[PDB]
Amino acid sequence: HSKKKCDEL
Amino acid sequence: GSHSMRYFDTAMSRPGRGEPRFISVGYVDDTQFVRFDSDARAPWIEQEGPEYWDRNTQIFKTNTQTDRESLRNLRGYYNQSEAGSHTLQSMYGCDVGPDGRLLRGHNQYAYDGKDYIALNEDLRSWTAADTAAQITQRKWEAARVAEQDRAYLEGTCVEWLRRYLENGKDTLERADPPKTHVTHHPISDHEATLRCWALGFYPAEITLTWQRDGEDQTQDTELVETRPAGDRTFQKWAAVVVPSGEEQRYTCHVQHEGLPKPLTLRWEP
């Protein structure tokens, strides 16, 4: 199950 | 034994040829089970709902946009022009032991092939590579990102890895031992190559060594990179150059998870 990447670098 | 789940994400800009391509591939150990590609599934995955698939599809879409915006931000951090192509990679996921409990979580990034920022083993703090990644670190500290990542890694990651291992046990929990033989190839009247082969094994982790008179031949052994056969299994070989007539002083040693006991092999003429 994938993880949300919700924060820009 | 022990197992890992890992996602490998690549975002790559391509100025003049559209928006950056985003591809995310998920693995359990050495088995790929999912791929999402912005440029458009294992069997034990299909048995999850179409709801599971939608939820992951939505995540991939959001991740696509996040990494696209991150590529923009990164070129700013490094004073780079709009003209060149750049790559943002990330790896995340969890390792668990035989009992299915968390050993360690991972979440880290590289830009143009260079390590950029990583979540530390504590799942609470960051290690930034340079003054650009320090900007990311400060932003991520302010937004409490590590807490969200830790929640995924200790929860979702471990829980789903356990489920996949249960549903896919016949393959995911089966270690296939190497099939091994030693071949012999004359180089000249004076020397020959002994090549120790390991074929058909899963997972990829393996140890192949040559000894001469019980002594490790690390410096004199040619070891090829472990390579996929295309049928889930892997292959590897190790070779040494030996004086003609001295072949029996050399033994090949094989360790693999699928082996009851390690093998010791010699050339059998």
Binding site: - | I23, T87, D112, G113, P228
Partner: protein, 100 residues
């Protein structure tokens, strides 16, 4: 920027036996950035029926891909893999050798 040149291995899925259907593999790995051109060759001509794996990478961030096609080896047919990458002045050709 750092660039890394591809390693190349050319080999079959199963032990080679003349007249028996098999798979010809070209594994490219250790490279960066990810754009790469890979051709499988039969007596110098490009094979049309060639598939590849999905882009992934190793823990050192370098990319790898497997290119593959069904083939039936014979005594006299020569096979090879031809690779180009930003790090190469001209395409690198690696011959298929049954003993490697």
């Amino acid at each position: 920027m750092i660039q890394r040149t591809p390693k190349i291995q050319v080999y079959s899925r199963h032990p080679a036996e003349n007249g028996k259907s098999n798979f010809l593999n070209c594994y490219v790995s250790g490279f960066h950035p990810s754009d790469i051109e890979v051709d499988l060759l039969k007596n110098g001509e490009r094979i049309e029926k060639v598939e590849h794996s999905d882009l992934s990478f190793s823990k050192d961030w370098s990319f790898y891909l497997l290119y593959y096609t069904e083939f039936t080896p014979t005594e006299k047919d020569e096979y090879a893999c031809r690779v180009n990458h930003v790090t190469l002045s001209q395409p690198k050709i690696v011959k298929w050798d049954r003993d490697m």
